UniProtKB/Swiss-Prot annotation:
Residues 3-145 are annotated as: GART. It comes from Brevibacillus parabrevis. Disulfide bonds: none annotated. Belongs to the ATP-dependent AMP-binding enzyme family. Keywords: Antibiotic biosynthesis, Ligase, Multifunctional enzyme, Phosphopantetheine, Phosphoprotein, Repeat. The keyword Repeat applies. The modification O-(pantetheine 4'-phosphoryl)serine is found at S716. This is Linear gramicidin synthase subunit A. Two module-bearing peptide synthase with a C-terminal epimerization domain, which is probably inactive. Each module incorporates one amino acid into the peptide product and can be further subdivided into domains responsible for substrate adenylation, thiolation, condensation (not for the initiation module), and epimerization (optional). At the N-terminus, contains a N-formyltransferase domain that is probably responsible for the formylation of the first incorporated amino acid. The chain holds residues 2 to 1198 of 2273 of the full protein.
C-alpha cells in the first residue's frame, strides 16, 4: 500500500528488492542522485529504503521520516561503518555479516533491526565476497520486510566500537579486487607494520666486545696483527687527538688510506671521537678524490705521506704514521653519540648523473650487524676477508659485522685480490671461513678448489652461476647503498632460472607497488620499495632529491625508499629480482628484459660471461647486442642457432660482440657504459629487391639469401604483409607459395616469370559483401539476439577526461564509413546505405567495482542494422577508475578492425593527426563480388566440393545430455601459459618451419582426438583474416571468414610428424579460404539442422600480440554466450598466451571444464618437451 522511495548507487542497484516491493503493490520511486530536505521527490513517501546510497541524508529528512528510513548495509555493524564495508571485513579480519538498520543522523549508526552472519571461503575473490554479501542482504530484506513494515521488530542499539572508513582509505588497495581471501591475507602479513628500538652505537657494541675477547686476534695484515685490546687502545689514542681537534657528533672526517691495519684503526677512531668517516680510496681518479673531498664537509683528513699529496692540501691532514697524532690516553672516550648520528658517508658511482653522498646512521649499521651475527652464526673462531674497497658498503660488511662477533679480519694482499688462484691459496692457508664477494668476483672464485670457506655471501648484481668447487653455502644478498649494505638475504639451495634475492632482514619490510604507489598482488611485478631500520638519513647536501627518493607514502605515511628496481613476490615469500625499470625495452613488437637472455647465452660451453644491451639506431628502433667473454670469437650463426633452441627470434641479439674480458668498475660490476659499439648477401637484382622487402616486413637490417622466413620472426600476419609489399612491385605471391618457398633463394626462381582497389563513386545504394549478407541473415532470424555483439572495456585512470574519450569516439564515426553504414532489404537483395553523419549513443554512469559487470550487461542490447551508427559507448566511473566500454555489432567490428579502432583511439587521445582513410569497405565488397565470377573462385570452391563430399568424422566431446535444440548459453575459463613456456613453444615452431598457430592447432587437434578414443581424424573450425585485397588492411568492417579444418592424427607417429601433416592440410585450406562459409556448407551437402552445428562443434581462433598498448588494455567482455559447444581462443598477452575456453553451459559445468583445462595443460606440457615422442605416449592424466 505505502509509497516507497528507493535510494541507491544507480537505478539498477538491488533490482530484486525493488521487484519484491512492487509485487506487494508498493509504488517504488528510484533515486540515485542526492536528495534535499525541501525536495519534490519526498512527496507522498511513506517509506525510504536506501541501498548503497552515495549521499548523506540531511538532519531534516531523518527527523521527518524517523522510524521509516531503512538501510541495507553489507557488514556486521558496528563493524565496518562507511565505504567498502566488505573489503575491510576481510582485510581487518572482522566479524562478517549483513545488517538492516534504521537510519539516524550519522553514518551507519542507527539501531539494528535484523542482523545475519556470513562466511567467505578462502578461495573466493573479493568480487565474489562483494556479490555474495549483496545477495545475502537482499534476500534478508525480502524475508523480513513484512515484519519491518508492521513494526513488529524490536530495534536494538549498536554496540560501541567499530571502524568508520572513507573513500580514500582504500586507495592503497585499489589493485586487489581480483585476489582471493587467502591471497589477500597473505599479502597483509608481508606488507603491514607490526605492533624494540636500537639504543646503541657501533663503538659502544665494539667496546663491549673488547672486554669479552681482549686477547683475540682482531685484524691481520700479512704477518702483522692486532688483538681486540691492542686495536681498541690505539684507536682510543687517535680518538682523543681527533676529538681534541674539534670533532663533534655528525662531523665528517675523511680517510684516505690503503687497506691496512692503519685503516681499521682510523675508522674506529673517527667513531669513538664522535664523527662519521668518509672513505676515499686512493686508487680513485684524481677528479673523483677532489670531488669527494669538496662535496664532503670534512675538515680533517686521515692519510699517509704516500697519499698526502692527492688531497691538494685541501684539508687539515692528520698523519696516521706521525706519533704526535696519538694521545697517551688508552681509555675509551666518554660517549657523546646517539644511535641517530652519522656513522659514515659513501658516494654513489658518478655514472648515472653526479655522484651523491649517502648518509648512514649508527642505528642503520647496528641493525645489520646484530642481524648478521646470528643469521650466519659467526663465532670468535671465524675469519673474514677485507676484500671490497673501503669506499663501498660491501666493506662495511667485511669490517663491522665480524668485529662485533669477535672474529679476525684479514686484509687481502693487493697482489692476491685480482689473482683468485692466489686468493684461494691465502684462504686455504689461513683458514678463512666467511666473507662477502661482489657477484663478479664471486662467480670467478667458484672455479677455485676451496676448502676453507663455510659461507660465501655475494651481491651487487644478478647471480648467474652457482656450480662451484667448494663445500660452502652460497648466499645471494640484495640492497642499495641508500639502505645499508643489504636488506634481503637468500640461501642458494638449488638451481634457479632466476635466483631469488630472498626475504627481508631484521626490522625491514619490502613493498611491491605500481606507479601510483598502490600495493601489487603477490606474484605481480612492481617497483621495489624498502621500509624499516635500514633507510639512511638521505643524500648529502641534496634535500630535494632526498625527498624524491625517500618518500613519505601519501596513504600509509611511512618513510620508504624508491629503489628503481623491478621485483615481484613469490608465493613462498621470497622476493624475485627482475632488473631495473629502465632496462625494459620494446624489440620488434615485444616488451622484454634483455637480462633474461643472458643465462641462455651463458650456458654455452665456450662462454663464461655475458651481458645483453639494448641499443638505438637512426630509425629510432631498438636492437639487442649480446656481449660475451670467450677464449675465441664464436661464429654468429652458431650463437644464433644455440639460442634458437629456447628463444623466439625477437629475443636473439642481432649482433654478437666477442671480448677478452668485460670492463668493470671500482665496485666490481660490469661497466655497461664502457662496452664497445658495433663495427649470403643478395647479388642478383631481384634478390636485392626481395631482401629490402623482407628487411622491412620483419624489421631486420640484413637478410640472408637462405634465411628461413619463420626462423627470422615471420608469422601469418607478416606473410600477408609480404604479399602486400610484393604487389607494390607488380609481383603476385600466394600464401601457400611462401611456405613451400620460405627463402629468398626459393622465391627468386618463383617470381622471375611473374591493380589498386578502385574507390566507388557516389551512389544511393551499394552492394554488400558475402559475409555482410550472412550477418544480416542471422540477425534477421532472431531479431533481438545479441550473440553477434562485440563488447570491449578499457580501464582509464580518473585523470582522463570523460569528454575527450567521447570526442575521440565521435571523430572515429566521421572517419570510418562503417560507423555510418546501415543495412536494408531491397527486394531479395541485402543492400547498404551510407549516411554523412550519425549521433553516437554515449552514456555516463557511476557504479562500484563489484557492480561493473552488472551495469554493463544492461547496456548490451540488440542492434537495428538499418540504424547508424552500429556502435554504442559509455563510461562507468567507480571510486578508483574510469571504465570505458563500447558495444558494436559483429557485421562491422571484426578482429583486425578492433586493432585499428584501438590504434587510432590511442592516437586521438594523444593529440595526433590522422590522414584521411584512402579506401572504403564498399569498394572491397564490389571488388569481391565481381571476383566470385572468376576462374580462381571456381578453383577454390572446387577444393571444398572434393574435400567435404565423403563421410565426415564426427567428433564427440564429453558433455552432459545435449539440449534438444541449439543453445547458446555460455561461460568462460582462462588458462595462462607463462612467458617461459610460451618462449619455448615459439622457438620450437620456428625451428621446424611452423608458425605458433600451426603448433597450437596440432595440440588442440590431438587433444580432441584423445577425447574421441584416439580417432584418426578430427574436424574443427577456425577463423581467417578475410582481408583478400591488400588495400583493406586499414578498413573497418567484417572480413573474417569461417573455415572447416579436416585434420588427421597418426598416434603411431611422432609429435613432429603430426605437426608437419597438420601443416600439409592447413595450407590448402588457407589457399582456398576466400569462399564464403555458406557456399562451403552448400558444397558439402550439409544443412543447419538438429541440435549440432553444421560442420563442427569446436572452434579454434588465435590472435597475435597487440599492436599498441591501448589494445593490450582492451578486454573482450562475454555476455554469457557460446556460439559453439566449445571455443578456444589463444591471445598473446604479456609475452604469454591467454587461452580462453568459451563453452556451452548446458554441455559443461564449471567442474568438467576445469578438468578439461588441466588435461589440456598437461597435454601441452608433454608435447612441448616431447617433440620426437610418439603421440600415443601423451596422456591426459
Ligand atoms: N544519516 C545517514 N546515515 C546513514 O547511515 C546513511 C546515510 N545517511 N546515507 C546513505 C548511506 C551512507 N552513504 C554514504 C556515502 C558516501 C559518503 C561520503 O561521502 N563519505 C566521504 C566522507 C563523508 C564526509 O564528508 O564526512 C568519504 O570520503 O568517504 C558517506 C555516506 N547510509 C547507510 O548506509
Ligand atoms: N643480489 C642482487 N641481485 C641482483 N641485483 C642486485 C643485487 N644486489 C644489488 N643489485 C643491483 O644493484 C643495485 C644496488 O647496487 P649499489 O651498491 O647500491 C650501487 P648501483 O645502484 O649499482 O649504482 P650507483 O653507484 O650509480 O648508485 C640494486 O638497486 C640492484 O639494481
Ligand atoms: P599463421 O600464424 O599460421 O596464422 C594463421 C591464421 C590464424 C589463419 C591467420 O592467417 C589469421 O587469419 N589470423 C587472424 C585470425 C583472427 O581474426 N583471430 C581473431 C578472431 N576473433 C574475432 O573475430 C572476434 N571478434 C573481435 O575480436 C570474435 C569472432 C570472437
Ligand atoms: C653488500 C652491498 C655491496 C650490496 N650487495 C649492494 O648491492 O650494494
Ligand atoms: Mg644507485
Amino acid at each position: 500500500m505505502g509509497r516507497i522511495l528507493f535510494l541507491t548507487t544507480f537505478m539498477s542497484k538491488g533490482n530484486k528488492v525493488v521487484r519484491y516491493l512492487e509485487s506487494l503493490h508498493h509504488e517504488v520511486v528510484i533515486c540515485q542522485e542526492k536528495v534535499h530536505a525541501q525536495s519534490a521527490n519526498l512527496q507522498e513517501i511513506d517509506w525510504i529504503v536506501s541501498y548503497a546510497y552515495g549521499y548523506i541524508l540531511d538532519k531534516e529528512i531523518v527527523s521527518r521520516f524517523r522510524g521509516r528510513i531503512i538501510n541495507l548495509h553489507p557488514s556486521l555493524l558496528p563493524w565496518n561503518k562507511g565505504r567498502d564495508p566488505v573489503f575491510w571485513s576481510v582485510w581487518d579480519e572482522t566479524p562478517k555479516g549483513v545488517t538492516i538498520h534504521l537510519i539516524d543522523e550519522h553514518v551507519d549508526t542507527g539501531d539494528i533491526l535484523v542482523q545475519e552472519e556470513i562466511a567467505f571461503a578462502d578461495e573466493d575473490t573479493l568480487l565474489d565476497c562483494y556479490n555474495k554479501a549483496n545477495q545475502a542482504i537482499e534476500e534478508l530484506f525480502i524475508r523480513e520486510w513484512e515484519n519491518i513494515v508492521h513494526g513488529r521488530i524490536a530495534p536494538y542499539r549498536q554496540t560501541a566500537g567499530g571502524t568508520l572508513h572513507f573513500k580514500a582509505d582504500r586507495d592503497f588497495y585499489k589493485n586487489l579486487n581480483m585476489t582471493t581471501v587467502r591471497e589477500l591475507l597473505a599479502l597483509k602479513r608481508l606488507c603491514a607494520e607490526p605492533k624494540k628500538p636500537i639504543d646503541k652505537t657501533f663503538h659502544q657494541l665494539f667496546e663491549q666486545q673488547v672486554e669479552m675477547t681482549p686477547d683475540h686476534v682482531a685484524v691481520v695484515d700479512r704477518g702483522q696483527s692486532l688483538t681486540y685490546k691492542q686495536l681498541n687502545e690505539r684507536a682510543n689514542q687517535l680518538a682523543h687527538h681527533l676529538r681534541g681537534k674539534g670533532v663533534k657528533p655528525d662531523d665528517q672526517v675523511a680517510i684516505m688510506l690503503d687497506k691496512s691495519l692503519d685503516m681499521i684503526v682510523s675508522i674506529l677512531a673517527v667513531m669513538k671521537a664522535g664523527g662519521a668517516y668518509v672513505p676515499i680510496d686512493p686508487d680513485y681518479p684524481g677528479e673523483r678524490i677532489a670531488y669527494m673531498l669538496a662535496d664532503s664537509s670534512a675538515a680533517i683528513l686521515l692519510t699517509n705521506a704516500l697519499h698526502e699529496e692527492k688531497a691538494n692540501g685541501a684539508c687539515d691532514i692528520i698523519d696516521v704514521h706521525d706519533p704526535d697524532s696519538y694521545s697517551e690516553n688508552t681509555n675509551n672516550l666518554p660517549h657523546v653519540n646517539r644511535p641517530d648520528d652519522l656513522v659514515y658517508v659513501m658516494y654513489t658511482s658518478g655514472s648515472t648523473g653526479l655522484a651523491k653522498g649517502v648518509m648512514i646512521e649508527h642505528h642503520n649499521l647496528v641493525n645489520f650487524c646484530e642481524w648478521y651475527r646470528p643469521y650466519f652464526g659467526v663465532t670468535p673462531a671465524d675469519k673474514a676477508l677485507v676484500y671490497s674497497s673501503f669506499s663501498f658498503d660491501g666493506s662495511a660488511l667485511d669490517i663491522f659485522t665480524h668485529l662485533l662477533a669477535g672474529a679476525a679480519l684479514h686484509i687481502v694482499p693487493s697482489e692476491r685480490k685480482y689473482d683468485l688462484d692466489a686468493l684461494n691459496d691465502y684462504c686455504n692457508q689461513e683458514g678463512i671461513t666467511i666473507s662477502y664477494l661482489p657477484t663478479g668476483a664471486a662467480e670467478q672464485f667458484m672455479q677455485m678448489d676451496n676448502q676453507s670457506f663455510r659461507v660465501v655471501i655475494t651481491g651487487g648484481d644478478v647471480l648467474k652461476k652457482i656450480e662451484r668447487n667448494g663445500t660452502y653455502k652460497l648466499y645471494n644478498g640484495y640492497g642499495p647503498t641508500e639502505c645499508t649494505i643489504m636488506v634481503t638475504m637468500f640461501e642458494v639451495d638449488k638451481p634457479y632460472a632466476n635466483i631469488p634475492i630472498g626475504k627481508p632482514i631484521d626490522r625491514t619490510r619490502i613493498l611491491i607497488l605500481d606507479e601510483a604507489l598502490a600495493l601489487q598482488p603477490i606474484g605481480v611485478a612492481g617497483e621495489l620499495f624498502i621500509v624499516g631500520e635500514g633507510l639512511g638519513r638521505g643524500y648529502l647536501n641534496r634535500p630535494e632529491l632526498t625527498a624524491e627518493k625517500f618518500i613519505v607514502h601519501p596513504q600509509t605515511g611511512e618513510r620508504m625508499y624508491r629503489t628503481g628496481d623491478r621485483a615481484r613476490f613469490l608465493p613462498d615469500g621470497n622476493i624475485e629480482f627482475l632488473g631495473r625499470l629502465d632496462n625494459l625495452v620494446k624489440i620488434r613488437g615485444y616488451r622484454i628484459e634483455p637480462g633474461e637472455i643472458e643465462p641462455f647465452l651463458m650456458n654455452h660451453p665456450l662462454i663464461e660471461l655475458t651481458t645483453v644491451l639494448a641499443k638505438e639506431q637512426a630509425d629510432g628502433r631498438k636492437y639487442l647486442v649480446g656481449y660475451y667473454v670467450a677464449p675465441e670469437e664464436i661464429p654468429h650463426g652458431e650463437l644464433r642457432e644455440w639460442l634458437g633452441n629456447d628463444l623466439p627470434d625477437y629475443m636473439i641479439p642481432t649482433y654478437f660482440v666477442h671480448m677478452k674480458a668485460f670492463p668493470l668498475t671500482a665496485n666490481g660490476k660490469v661497466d655497461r657504459r664502457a662496452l664497445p659499439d658495433v663495427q649470403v648477401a643478395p647479388t642478383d637484382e631481384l634478390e636485392q629487391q626481395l631482401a629490402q622487402v623482407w628487411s622491412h616486413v620483419l624489421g631486420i637490417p640484413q637478410m640472408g639469401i637462405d634465411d628461413h622466413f619463420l626462423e627470422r620472426g615471420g608469422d601469418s600476419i607478416k606473410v600477408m604483409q609480404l604479399i602486400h609489399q610484393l604487389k607494390n612491385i607488380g609481383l603476385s605471391l600466394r600464401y601457400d607459395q611462401l611456405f613451400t618457398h620460405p627463402t629468398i633463394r626459393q622465391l627468386k626462381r618463383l617470381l622471375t616469370e611473374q591493380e589498386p582497389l578502385r574507390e566507388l563513386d557516389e551512389q544511393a545504394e551499394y552492394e554488400t559483401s558475402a559475409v555482410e549478407k550472412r550477418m544480416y541473415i542471422i540477425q534477421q532470424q532472431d531479431v533481438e539476439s545479441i550473440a553477434y555483439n562485440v563488447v570491449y572495456t578499457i580501464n582509464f585512470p580518473l585523470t582522463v577526461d570523460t569528454e575527450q574519450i567521447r570526442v575521440a569516439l565521435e571523430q572515429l564515426v566521421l572517419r570510418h564509413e562503417g560507423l555510418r553504414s546501415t543495412y536494408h532489404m531491397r527486394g531479395d537483395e541485402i543492400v547498404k546505405r551510407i549516411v554523412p553523419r550519425a549521433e553516437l549513443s554515449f552514456v555516463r554512469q557511476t557504479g562500484e567495482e563489484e557492480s561493473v559487470q552488472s551495469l554493463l550487461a544492461e547496456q548490451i542490447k540488440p542492434f537495428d542494422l538499418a540504424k547508424a551508427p552500429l556502435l554504442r559507448a559509455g563510461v562507468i566511473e567507480t571510486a578508483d577508475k574510469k571504465v570505458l566500454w563500447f558495444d558494436s555489432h559483429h557485421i562491422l567490428l571484426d578482429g583486425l578492425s578492433k586493432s585499428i579502432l584501438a590504434r587510432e583511439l590511442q592516437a586521438l587521445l594523444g593529440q595526433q593527426v590522422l590522414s584521411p582513410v584512402e579506401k572504403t569497405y564498399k569498394s572491397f565488397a564490389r571488388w569481391q563480388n565481381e571476383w566470385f565470377a572468376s576462374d580462381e573462385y571456381e578453383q577454390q570452391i572446387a577444393y571444398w566440393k572434393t574435400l567435404l563430399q565423403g563421410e565426415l568424422p564426427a567428433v564427440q566431446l564429453p558433455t552432459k545430455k545435449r539440449p534438444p535444440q541449439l543453445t547458446f548459453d555460455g561461460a568462460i575459463q582462462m588458462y595462462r601459459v607463462n612467458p617461459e613456456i610460451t618462449r619455448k613453444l615459439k622457438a620450437t615452431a620456428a625451428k621446424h618451419d611452423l608458425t605458433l598457430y600451426m603448433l597450437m592447432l596440432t595440440i588442440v587437434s590431438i587433444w580432441l582426438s584423445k577425447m574421441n578414443s584416439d580417432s584418426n581424424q578430427v574436424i574443427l573450425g577456425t577463423v581467417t583474416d578475410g582481408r583478400q585485397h591488400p588495400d583493406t588492411r586499414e578498413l573497418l568492417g567484417m572480413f573474417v571468414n569461417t573455415l572447416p579444418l579436416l585434420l588427421s592424427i597418426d598416434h603411431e607417429e611422432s609429435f613432429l610428424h603430426n605437426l608437419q601433416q597438420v601443416k600439409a592440410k592447413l595450407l590448402p585450406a588457407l589457399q582456398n579460404q576466400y569462399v564464403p562459409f555458406d557456399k562451403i556448407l552448400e558444397a558439402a551437402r550439409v544443412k543447419r539442422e538438429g541440435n549440432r552445428h553444421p560442420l563442427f562443434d569446436v572452434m579454434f581462433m588465435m590472435q597475435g600480440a597487440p599492436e599498441t598498448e591501448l589494445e593490450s588494455n582492451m578486454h573482450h567482455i562475454n555476455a554469457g554466450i557460446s556460439k559453439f559447444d566449445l571455443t578456444l581462443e589463444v591471445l598473446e598477452r604479456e609475452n604469454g598466451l591467454n587461452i580462453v575456453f568459451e563453452y556451452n553451459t548446458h554441455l559443461f559445468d564449471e567442474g568438467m571444464i576445469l578438468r578439461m583445462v588441466a588435461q589440456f595443460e598437461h597435454l601441452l606440457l608433454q608435447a612441448v618437451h616431447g617433440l620426437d615422442q610418439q603421440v600415443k605416449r601423451f596422456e591426459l592424466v
